[PDB]
């Protein structure tokens, strides 16, 4: 799109992230096997749910804090996330662990968004998250084979214990 063909990786990301938030919003592993994202989407979903939730487990208090600051209510919610998104990557550290954290937070919001019956915004939320991400770090994703490298580096579990 804007620069080259980053939309290829975007297709997967948009769906993979959505599947994660949809699964987190329900709290049940009901999300159907995404075929749109391909095999990488399957591998990523496994990782995304385990690692994404892990981010919440150790610092949920932080997500709860930001959740109360995020003016999520109207369509402006997608702009609200963009506001924090731009600031989160201001120091330039795009390290893989940070991306998973962005999704982690967005999904945490999606969970409460589901309980407040504002699911009409959770759907475009993942889309807003993935779009901005891919348009600003198209090269970054490519460097780690997109979700393929993400899964390879995060599919493994802790070895230290905790």
């Amino acid at each position: 799109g804007p620069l080259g063909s980053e939309d290829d990786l975007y297709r997967q990301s948009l769906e993979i992230i959505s599947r994660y938030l949809r699964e987190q919003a329900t709290g049940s592993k009901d999300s159907k096997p995404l075929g749109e994202a391909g095999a990488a989407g399957r591998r990523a979903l496994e990782t995304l749910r385990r690692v994404g939730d892990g981010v919440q487990r150790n610092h949920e208090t932080a997500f709860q804090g930001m959740l109360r600051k995020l003016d999520i209510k109207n369509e402006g919610d997608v702009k609200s996330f963009s506001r924090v998104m731009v600031h989160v990557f201001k120091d330039g550290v795009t390290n893989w662990g940070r991306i998973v954290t962005l999704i982690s937070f967005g999904a945490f919001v999606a969970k409460h968004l589901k309980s407040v019956n504002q699911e009409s915004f959770i759907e475009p939320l993942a889309e807003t998250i993935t779009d901005v991400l891919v348009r600003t770090k198209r090269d970054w994703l490519v460097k780690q084979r997109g979700w393929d490298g993400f899964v390879e580096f995060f599919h493994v579990q802790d070895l230290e214990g905790g």
């Binding site: 690692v51 892990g54 981010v55 150790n58 610092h59 932080a62 804090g65 930001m66 600051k69 506001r83 924090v84 600031h87 989160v88 120091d91 550290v93 390290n95 893989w96 662990g97 940070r98 991306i99 998973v100 954290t101 962005l102 982690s104 937070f105 580096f153 995060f154 493994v156 802790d158 070895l159 230290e160």
Partner: peptide, 27 residues
């Protein structure tokens, strides 16, 4: 509004801590 500075600051650090842990976790 501007108080989001401290909020996003956390999100950044939480992301770094994940990458940090998983990095040594592997190698």
């Amino acid at each position: 509004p501007a108080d989001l500075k401290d909020e996003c600051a956390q999100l950044r650090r939480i992301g770094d801590k994940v990458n940090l842990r998983q990095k040594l976790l592997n190698m």
